[PDB]
Amino acid sequence: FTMDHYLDIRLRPDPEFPPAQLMSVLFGKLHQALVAQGGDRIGVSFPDLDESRSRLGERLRIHASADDLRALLARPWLEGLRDHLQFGEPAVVPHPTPYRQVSRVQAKSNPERLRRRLMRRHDLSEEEARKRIPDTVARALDLPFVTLRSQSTGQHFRLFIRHGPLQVTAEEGGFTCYGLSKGGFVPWF
């Protein structure tokens, strides 16, 4: 009733398995696919496949109702792989209630950028640009890693995804997707 279709993809094993890079190419091809389609009406999740909360799953599930799904990256609208997945076909969802959330976050682990932005913003001096308020004392960080090289005009990002409150508490009908490529309230298993 929220977005009632799912694709239980299973990335097969392969003697080349950089998971950051496999999910990088997959999420990047998905980015290309949905910016070619166009629309803030799509869902993406990652079911309970992260055993620890360090790794990330070897699976995926896309949540678009009928038309965006069948027209977007699917059996039509080429993936360009069709061999490394051998995936299936979607169908209607059951009735769970884990409160349905996923999230994107990014942190700061390179104060060179911040000091350079200070130097650029109002022509800061080197001594204060060195000790006004960097975070040289401690380097923040985030656990779940995916690489996702730049869509264009850039270089290797390192994107972080935190599963939101997945509590068996309630449910609500909210927006379709936040960010750009990531649904909002999404059914979870």
36, 49, 133, 166: which one contacts RNA (CB under 7 A)?
133
Q: Which residues contact 168 (CB under 8 A, 6 or more apart)?
A: 97, 98, 99
Report the alpha-carbon distance of residue 2 to residue 60 in Å, rounded: 18
Residue 78 engages RNA in binding (rule: CB under 7 A): no
Residue 136 engages RNA in binding (rule: CB under 7 A): no
Q: Which residues contact 124 (CB under 8 A, 6 or more apart)?
A: 118, 132
C-beta of 165 vs 179, nearer to RNA = 179
DSSP 65-101: -SHHHHHSSSSSS--S-SSS------B------S---
31 as an active site residue: the answer is yes
Residue 10 engages RNA in binding (rule: CB under 7 A): no
Which entry of 5, 31, 63, 163 is annotated as an active-site residue?
A: 31
130 three-state secondary structure: helix
Question: Which region, judged by CB under 7 A, interacts with RNA, from 40-48, 59-67, 71-79, 147-155?
Answer: 147-155
Question: Which region, judged by CB under 7 A, interacts with RNA, from 44-52, 64-72, 92-100, 114-122?
Answer: 114-122
87, 145, 185, 188: which one contacts RNA (CB under 7 A)?
145
CB of 91 to RNA, least distance (A): 30
Comparing C-alpha atoms, which of 151, 149, 178 is closest to residue 20?
Answer: 149
Residue 38 engages RNA in binding (rule: CB under 7 A): no
Cβ atoms within 10 Å of 14's Cβ, excluding its own: 10
Binding site for RNA (CB under 7 A): 15-21, 55, 104-110, 112-114, 116-118, 120-121, 132-133, 135, 139-143, 145, 147, 150-151, 153-158, 179-180
